[PDB]
Nanobody, 751 residues
Framework: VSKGEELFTGVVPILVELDGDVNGHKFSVSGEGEGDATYGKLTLKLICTTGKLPVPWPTLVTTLGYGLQCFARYPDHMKQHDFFKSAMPEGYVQERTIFFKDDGNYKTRAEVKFEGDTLVNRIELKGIDFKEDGNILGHKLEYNYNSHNVYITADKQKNGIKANFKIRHNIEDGGVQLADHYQQNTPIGDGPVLLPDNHYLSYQSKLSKDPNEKRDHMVLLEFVTAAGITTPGWLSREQVFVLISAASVNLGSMMCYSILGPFFPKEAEKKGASNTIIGMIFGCFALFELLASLVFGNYLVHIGAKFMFVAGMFVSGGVTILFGVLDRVPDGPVFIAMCFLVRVMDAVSFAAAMTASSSILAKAFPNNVATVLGSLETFSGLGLILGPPVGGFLYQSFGYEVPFIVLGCVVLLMVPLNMYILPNYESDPGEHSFWKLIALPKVGLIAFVINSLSSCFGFLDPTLSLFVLEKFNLPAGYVGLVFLGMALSYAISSPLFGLLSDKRPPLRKWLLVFGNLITAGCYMLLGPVPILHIKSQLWLLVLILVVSGLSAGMSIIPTFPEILSCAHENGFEEGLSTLGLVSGLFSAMWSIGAFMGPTLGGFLYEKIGFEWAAAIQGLWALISGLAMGLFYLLEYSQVQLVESGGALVQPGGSLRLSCAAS????????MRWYRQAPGKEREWVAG????????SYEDSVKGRFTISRDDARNTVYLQMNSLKPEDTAVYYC????????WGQGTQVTVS
């Protein structure tokens, strides 16, 4: 707890200083930058104020980035344990002892102060016993940097923390240099101390050069995350306290939403609404809810979530009683400006509810994004299946009014109780264009899929009732429950294909494609041409509609994590505004499907029969699903490694291991081979340089291991002879192209 803790968020500009005396050589570096504690980024452009550096660049990165640890993104249960963020406006000091393996040493002292709004960093270091012909001063350090963990514990003897981290520097010969870092961090002031437990920090550092800076310089795009303590497995009551509200929002509305649909032919000719007017009801219900959801997703930050959400059903609590009785008055010169007062504010009532609710749902659970959406969907399905059987008494009470007062009282009494739930105040507006968000080709291709999936349901819903009268002849109340089977299958597909979509991320894309593919199948048997000579059996049509609902429910849910990852990976922000604009995107792309689908399908039904009228929508969805493979199966350039060749070993012998690559070429890159022993930490074994003329070997396997590379298939082989009983371990392959990427690794058991 501190006065500057709440002001620490947002951008905070940084001033960075450095003077240093390494091996009798004096130099100085100064620079500027900024970052965030909520985003976690840290961009620092450093320029040498002296000239040619007597040290390699990454050897200074560990004392210029890890010296600036005020910007640390901590998780929820770790927010108490912020010692670097404990007190900024006084300043703190950091003493680091840096050792190298069998080489010289660094000692540095760090003073950081906070004046006004900006942060000043002052570093001084002394470097002793370094050689010109060694690994360091020969400029043998490759201009890349890896990902390392920082292990922090606290001590109350000097009210501070002590930390350790070992850094692997890459070598142009191929090997690594181990930098031991011991940290003693204390605060200057006598203020309150926020003592951490045992925890660790994770880093992801970039290292690039801008050509427009003429002198010696570097650019850091460090990303720092935190972890360390296992969270309790129980669900917190504060997070239930919003999930109950979201469940009530999705549950109470759908009864009124489902009963207002077929209610309208009780008055459609009382109002004098001709087919042009009936058509413009659907036209307004499409386009006005497009515009409303779009402007809401644009201006969620400016309006704010509270009056967005708790009044989001107050207008729905108005439209549940707006149809109180409309057989009373002879709307004559009333109905000139009432046709957009019948169902348009119903549309913005349920567009304003779901756009906000999806955003506040997805904010609370980043680790379970698809699970809780599927949970609300299966709660919706359980509400929909048991929807109208409770009406067998109530609207026989005193007339035709009853479904719009008694349930209207429930909505009007449940609407003001949603005010306790939202504590959310404010975020930042989105800087990138929402048109630029759409103009990304990935959303530009999933848009057509989600419009097709909406068009399927929109065409099918007023079609089975007019179809099954002819060759099946079921009564009106029977027309419902087939459809209920579909809902049952959406329920079966609501969490089961959602929770799995949280487990394995890269499996979702093909899964989405698979959904679309089987969606094509589920209409080709729906209305078949009798060239296929299938008989209209009830059981086969029921089964193909159940697997239709299963496919639709399996394909609807992983749309939202896919577009979240699409917005995340392509350089947009990481916050509530991006989540809200993605939710409005989903709202608009769902709402346009009520206009693309039912119009042309209802036109072509009476024209060509519900065989080819179903077949045109089926082929439309089939082309919609087939379009996804052009962007997935042609640009599947995610970098990954495949390791194999490990099995049981007869002791004192010869075998081989291999690892192949995908996502990058090996024309200008090096590669490493690591080993994890049981119970002991990792250790560099082999290294193939970018040139490949030479290689680097561990001394314990020197003269025993042969590394080889085949450039055509991007395959790398490691062979040996006379294996040892200590060589029961798991081997990893490491590559460094804009991240430190590792493979899964495989086992060698010398038994």
């Amino acid at each position: 707890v501190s006065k500057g803790e709440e002001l620490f968020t947002g951008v905070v500009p940084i001033l960075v200083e450095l003077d240093g005396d390494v091996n009798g050589h004096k130099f100085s570096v100064s620079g500027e930058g900024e970052g965030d504690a909520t985003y976690g980024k840290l961009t620092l452009k450093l320029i040498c104020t002296t000239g040619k550096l007597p040290v390699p660049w990454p050897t200074l990165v560990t004392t210029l980035g890890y010296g600036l640890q005020c910007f640390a993104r901590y998780p929820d249960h770790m927010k108490q344990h912020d010692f670097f963020k404990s007190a900024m406006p006084e300043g703190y000091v950091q003493e680091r002892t840096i050792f190298f393996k069998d080489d010289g040493n660094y000692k540095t002292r760090a003073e950081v102060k906070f004046e006004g709004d900006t942060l000043v960093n002052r570093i001084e270091l002394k470097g002793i016993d370094f050689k010109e012909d060694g690994n360091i001063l020969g400029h043998k350090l490759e201009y890349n940097y890896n990902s390392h963990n920082v292990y922090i514990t606290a001590d109350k003897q000097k009210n501070g923390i002590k930390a350790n981290f070992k850094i692997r520097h890459n070598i142009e010969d191929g090997g690594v240099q181990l930098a031991d870092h011991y940290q003693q961090n204390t605060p200057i002031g006598d203020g309150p101390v926020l003592l951490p437990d045992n925890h660790y920090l994770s880093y992801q550092s970039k290292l690039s050069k801008d050509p427009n800076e003429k002198r010696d310089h570097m650019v850091l795009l460090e990303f720092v995350t935190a972890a360390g303590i296992t969270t309790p497995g129980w669900l917190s009551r504060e997070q239930v306290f919003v999930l109950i509200s979201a469940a009530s929002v999705n549950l109470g509305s759908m009864m009124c939403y489902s009963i207002l649909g077929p209610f309208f032919p009780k008055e459609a000719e009382k109002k004098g609404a001709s087919n042009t007017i009936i058509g413009m009801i659907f036209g307004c219900f499409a386009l006005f809810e497009l515009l409303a959801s779009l402007v809401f997703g644009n201006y969620l930050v400016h309006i704010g979530a509270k009056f967005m959400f708790v009044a989001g059903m107050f207008v729905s609590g108005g439209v549940t009683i707006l149809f109180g009785v409309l057989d009373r008055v002879p709307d004559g010169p009333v109905f000139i400006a009432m046709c957009f007062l019948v169902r348009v504010m119903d549309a913005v009532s349920f567009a304003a509810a779901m756009t906000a609710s999806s955003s506040i749902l997805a904010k609370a659970f980043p680790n379970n994004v698809a699970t809780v959406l599927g949970s609300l969907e299966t709660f919706s399905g359980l509400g929909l299946i048991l929807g109208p059987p409770v009406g067998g008494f109530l609207y026989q009470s005193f007339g035709y009014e009853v479904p719009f007062i008694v349930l209207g009282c429930v909505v009007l009494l449940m609407v003001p109780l949603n005010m306790y739930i939202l504590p959310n105040y404010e975020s930042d507006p989105g800087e990138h264009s929402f048109w630029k968000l759409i103009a990304l080709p990935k959303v530009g291709l999933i848009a057509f899929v989600i419009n097709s999936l909406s068009s399927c349901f929109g065409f099918l819903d007023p079609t089975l009732s007019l179809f099954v009268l002819e060759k099946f002849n079921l009564p009106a109340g029977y027309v419902g429950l087939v459809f209920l089977g579909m809902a049952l299958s959406y329920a079966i597909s609501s969490p089961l294909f959602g929770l799995l979509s949280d487990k394995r991320p890269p499996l979702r894309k093909w899964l989405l494609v698979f959904g679309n593919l089987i969606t094509a199948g589920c209409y080709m048997l729906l209305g078949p041409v009798p060239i296929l000579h299938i008989k209209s059996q009830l059981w086969l049509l029921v089964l193909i509609l159940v697997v239709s609902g299963l496919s639709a429910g399996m394909s609807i849910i992983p749309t939202f994590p896919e577009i979240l990852s699409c917005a995340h990976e392509n350089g947009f922000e990481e916050g509530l505004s991006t989540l809200g604009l993605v939710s409005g995107l989903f709202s608009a792309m769902w709402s346009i499907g009520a206009f693309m689908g039912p119009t042309l399908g209802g036109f072509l039904y009476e024209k060509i029969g519900f065989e080819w009228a179903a077949a045109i929508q089926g082929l439309w969805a089939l082309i919609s699903g087939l379009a996804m493979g052009l962007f997935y199966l042609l640009e599947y350039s995610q970098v990954q490694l495949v390791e194999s060749g490990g099995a049981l070993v007869q002791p004192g012998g010869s075998l081989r291991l291999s690892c192949a690559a995908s996502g990058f070429p090996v024309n200008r890159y090096s590669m490493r081979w690591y080993r994890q022993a049981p119970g002991k930490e990792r250790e560099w074994v082999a290294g193939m340089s970018s040139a490949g003329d030479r290689s680097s070997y561990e001394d314990s396997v020197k003269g025993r291991f042969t590394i080889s590379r085949d450039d055509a298939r991007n395959t790398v082989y490691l062979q040996m002879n006379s294996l040892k009983p200590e060589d029961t371990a798991v081997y990893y392959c490491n590559v460094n192209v804009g991240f430190e990427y590792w493979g899964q690794g495989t086992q060698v058991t010398v038994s």
